[PDB]
Amino acid sequence: LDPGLQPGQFSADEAGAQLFAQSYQSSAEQVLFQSVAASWAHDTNITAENARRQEEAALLSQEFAEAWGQKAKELYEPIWQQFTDPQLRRIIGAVRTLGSANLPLAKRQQYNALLSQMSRIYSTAKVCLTATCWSLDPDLTNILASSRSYAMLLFAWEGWHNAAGIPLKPLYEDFTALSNEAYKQDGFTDTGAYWRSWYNSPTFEDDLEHLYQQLEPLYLNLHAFVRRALHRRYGDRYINLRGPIPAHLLGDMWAQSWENIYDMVVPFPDKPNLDVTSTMLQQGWQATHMFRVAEEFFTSLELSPMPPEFWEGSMLEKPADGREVVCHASAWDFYNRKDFRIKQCTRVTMDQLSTVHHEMGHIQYYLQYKDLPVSLRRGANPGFHEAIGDVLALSVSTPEHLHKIGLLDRVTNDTESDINYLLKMALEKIAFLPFGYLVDQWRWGVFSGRTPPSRYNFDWWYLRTKYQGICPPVTRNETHFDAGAKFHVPNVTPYIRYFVSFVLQFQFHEALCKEAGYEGPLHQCDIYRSTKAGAKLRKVLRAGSSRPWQEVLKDMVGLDALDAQPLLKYFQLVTQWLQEQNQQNGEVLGWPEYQWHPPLPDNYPEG
Ligand SMILES: *[C@@H]1O[C@H](CO)[C@@H](O[C@@H]2O[C@H](CO)[C@@H](O)[C@H](O)[C@H]2NC(C)=O)[C@H](O)[C@H]1NC(C)=O
Numbered sequence: 373l374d375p376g377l378q379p380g381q382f383s384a385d386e387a388g389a390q391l392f393a394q395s396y397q398s399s400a401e402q403v404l405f406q407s408v409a410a411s412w413a414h415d416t417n418i419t420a421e422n423a424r425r426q427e428e429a430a431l432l433s434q435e436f437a438e439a440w441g442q443k444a445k446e447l448y449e450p451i452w453q454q455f456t457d458p459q460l461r462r463i464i465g466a467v468r469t470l471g472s473a474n475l476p477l478a479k480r481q482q483y484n485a486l487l488s489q490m491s492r493i494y495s496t497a498k499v500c501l502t503a504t505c506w507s508l509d510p511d512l513t514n515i516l517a518s519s520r521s522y523a524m525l526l527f528a529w530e531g532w533h534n535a536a537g538i539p540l541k542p543l544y545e546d547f548t549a550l551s552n553e554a555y556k557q558d559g560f561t562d563t564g565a566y567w568r569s570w571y572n573s574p575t576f577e578d579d580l581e582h583l584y585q586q587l588e589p590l591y592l593n594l595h596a597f598v599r600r601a602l603h604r605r606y607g608d609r610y611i612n613l614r615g616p617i618p619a620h621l622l623g624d625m626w627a628q629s630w631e632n633i634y635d636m637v638v639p640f641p642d643k644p645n646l647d648v649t650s651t652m653l654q655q656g657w658q659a660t661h662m663f664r665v666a667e668e669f670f671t672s673l674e675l676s677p678m679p680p681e682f683w684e685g686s687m688l689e690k691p692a693d694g695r696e697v698v699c700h701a702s703a704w705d706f707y708n709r710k711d712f713r714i715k716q717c718t719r720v721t722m723d724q725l726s727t728v729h730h731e732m733g734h735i736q737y738y739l740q741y742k743d744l745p746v747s748l749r750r751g752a753n754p755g756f757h758e759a760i761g762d763v764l765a766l767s768v769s770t771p772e773h774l775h776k777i778g779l780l781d782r783v784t785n786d787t788e789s790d791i792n793y794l795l796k797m798a799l800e801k802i803a804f805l806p807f808g809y810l811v812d813q814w815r816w817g818v819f820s821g822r823t824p825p826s827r828y829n830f831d832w833w834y835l836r837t838k839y840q841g842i843c844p845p846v847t848r849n850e851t852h853f854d855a856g857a858k859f860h861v862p863n864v865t866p867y868i869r870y871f872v873s874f875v876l877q878f879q880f881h882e883a884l885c886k887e888a889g890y891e892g893p894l895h896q897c898d899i900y901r902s903t904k905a906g907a908k909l910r911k912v913l914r915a916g917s918s919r920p921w922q923e924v925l926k927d928m929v930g931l932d933a934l935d936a937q938p939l940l941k942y943f944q945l946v947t948q949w950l951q952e953q954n955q956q957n958g959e960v961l962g963w964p965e966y967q968w969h970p971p972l973p974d975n976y977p978e979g
């Protein structure tokens with residue numbers, strides 16, 4: 373470690389911690405920057421040499437973390453948590469968690485290489501027919517979104533899960549062991565316990581389970597209504613009205629958002645078409661327009677525009693030179709208070725416009741907290757970070773807003789149009805909830821050893837069936853590693869944040885809508901141009917992780933806890949409608965034929 377980056381001496385006291393945190397921040401930006409930069413260079417241009425550079429950068433970060441971590445423990449391990457300065461306690465608490473820097477050098481290098489190889493496998497996996505091969509984004513994504521051929525959907529689903537998941541399994545086992553070895557040295561029973569600790573709630577798992585109990589009936593009704601729609605297209609051979617839905621038929625590789633099958637389920641087809649994708653295409657929208665439109669919503673609230681560095685540095689389309697890249701959308705803070713970027717293989721669709729807002733929400737958070745101490749440059753919890761852009765996107769997707777931006781000519785305000793809109797939003801928001809909940813239940817079980825390698829797939833599918841009510845369309849066994857075919861697993865990005873965000877965003881939306889002076893139905897609120905809503909949101913953003921999330925939330929929405937009631941209020945009309953429709957249609961709610969799997973197509977896979 374460069375002498376300039378090494379820790380000096382400080383008194384074994386609070387006033388010493390302060391000068392310590394200051395000296396840390398002075399070097400930590402440089403170390404954070406070099407790491408993020410090396411990661412960027414790799415993720416926008418996956419080469420062996422870029423992976424090598426990224427591993428060396430990670431090693432340097434671990435040296436830094438070890439040196440500053442050991443020093444924090446040297447001076448404070450017996451005494452440290454009684455500091456009067458709460459922000460200083462949070463800074464120190466973070467510095468002293470070494471994580472993978474607890475590993476001896478050889479195991480650090482093993483750990484860093486496993487992360488690089490898992491990233492490479494996921495982001496370069498292909499499905500091959502011909503000598504021609506399909507990438508996940510855009511090719512397989514487009515098949516899942518727009519093919520209605522059971523056999524073709526099956527080819528893409530099986531192809532992807534086999535190509536990504538199978539080779540990842542042995543690496544993921546090794547990663548899990550090393551990760552646990554690392555975090556056990558910080559005092560945590562396993563890595564999952566460390567991830568859950570970010571929510572600073574002793575009742576976190578119970579609180580989540582109680583939220584889900586309130587949400588589950590909404591999902592069960594949406595599921596039954598959708599299953600019926602699919603039965604009408606695919607027939608009795610491929611859809612069991614009392615069994616799980618085949619996992620490839622819901623518009624999305626993970627069945628996690630069902631927005632792409634909106635045309636099959638839309639209750640009132642003769643009302644305005646709320647999927648504006650075809651209008652974006654007809655109008656000639658490109659990625660640049662989508663980002664500028666998202667930016668203008670932020671500036672309408674008197675939040676910050678995207679800086680020149682963002683426009684100059686970002687990767688907003690998949691490179692056309694055919695470079696391998698990580699296409700999964702992400703937002704980047706380089707920790708130098710200047711560089712902030714999005715890396716997105718943007719496609720011209722309505723859902724992608726939502727994703728642009730999601731990512732830009734991350735960037736806005738970064739811009740607003742850039743001057744806090746580097747340890748406090750995080751969301752009040754990770755769920756807050758995931759919610760910011762989604763909240764704006766709730767206003768953007770309203771038929772009233774879409775009209776304002778030239779994407780929906782017809783204006784209607786009637787009960788059928790409301791049901792259509794709420795059903796569309798339910799396909800995006802309600803359909804996700806079981807998935808958002810289950811992914812880290814799976815991973816917490818892996819980290820804890822409740823799910824050893826011999827049960828990775830068995831337990832994955834148990835949870836997928838339990839929560840989502842889906843089944844794999846071909847037989848799976850433990851050679852398969854279907855959890856690994858979801859970005860966040862090989863890229864070691866925690867998932868519970870998304871479940872938390874999907875609840876939180878409605879709490880935020882309700883609060884901002886009230887602040888805006890809006891007095892109509894919550895689902896028709898548009899906060900566009902509300903500088904009062906902007907100011908309330910800015911308060912959250914500027915806090916970073918400097919204060920307890922429960923207090924930040926209380927200041928914002930008037931309650932110190934996650935609460936499903938705003939989500940339930942938002943969806944109330946369609947919740948009631950779906951329940952009525954399912955009863956009238958004689959549906960079974962749930963999937964009591966839990967063993968059921970669809971047959972294979974007759975000529976599969978030939979053709
Ligand atoms: C992608 O990464 C590679 C390195 O892994 C870059 O290749 C280097 O490019 C620089 C500047 O053009 C050269 O001077 C080196 O000789 C190159 N090294 C190798 C190993 O080829 C490549 O330029 C990067 N491409 C993009 C588009 O950023």
Ligand SMILES: *[C@@H]1O[C@H](CO[C@@H]2O[C@@H](C)[C@@H](O)[C@@H](O)[C@@H]2O)[C@@H](O)[C@H](O)[C@H]1NC(C)=O
Binds near residue numbers: 846847850851
């Ligand atoms: C796991 O499954 C692998 C391939 O799937 C199998 O063959 C396809 C065509 C289907 O018939 C499917 O039902 C079968 O499971 C096998 O190559 C592999 O042997 C299986 N793993 C173990 C340990 O048996």
Ligand SMILES: [Cl-]
Binds near residue numbers: 567
């Ligand atoms: Cl999280």
Ligand SMILES: [Zn+2]
Binds near residue numbers: 730758
């Ligand atoms: Zn995000």
